[PDB]
Amino acid sequence: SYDIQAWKKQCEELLNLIFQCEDSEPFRQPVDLLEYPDYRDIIDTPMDFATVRETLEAGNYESPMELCKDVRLIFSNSKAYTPSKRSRIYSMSLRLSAFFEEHISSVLSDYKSALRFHKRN
């Protein structure tokens, strides 16, 4: 497919699968500062999957690379805030990251191929 716009619905569908994963539940809404009172000492740019879906639906991503950067920030924030590599929540983040990366690969390749075809002449 050389459809330059196809990534958006493909990302909406992938976010729907991520919301069905039990492994996403900690990452769906912004971290709780009442429960994790030191969170913002450690983490400068909070990110979560509801924020990513809302940014997509607002038309405030120009490319699937920008969406991929924000999703990867969810996972780097979990790794930076974890006290241990054997954390429940960090452990869930690593499975959900593997799932995300397996599915986003074709979305990125197809978009980049479509843009190259657009500038072929």
Ligand X SMILES: CC(C)(C)OC(=O)Nc1cccc(CNC(=O)N2CCN(C(=O)c3ccco3)CC2)c1
78 binds ligand X (CB under 6 A): yes
Q: Least distance (Å) from ligand X to the CB of residue 56? A: 20
The nearer residue to ligand X, 85 or 119, going by C-beta atoms, is 85
Q: Least distance (Å) from ligand X to the CB of residue 84? A: 8
33 binds ligand X (CB under 6 A): no
Asked if residue 80 lies in contact with residue 105, where contact means CB atoms within 8 angstroms, the answer is no
29 binds ligand X (CB under 6 A): yes
Question: Which one of the spans 1-9, 13-21, 31-39, 110-118 is the region binding ligand X (CB under 6 A)?
Answer: 31-39
3-state secondary structure 2-33: CCCCCHHHHHHHHHHHHHHCHHHHHHCCCCCC
Report the distance separating Cα 64 and Cα 111, nearest Å: 8
103: which 2 tokens? 């599915």
Asked if residue 106 lies in contact with residue 13, where contact means CB atoms within 8 angstroms, the answer is no
Residues that bind ligand X (CB under 6 A): 25-26, 29, 31-32, 35-36, 78, 81-82, 87, 89-90
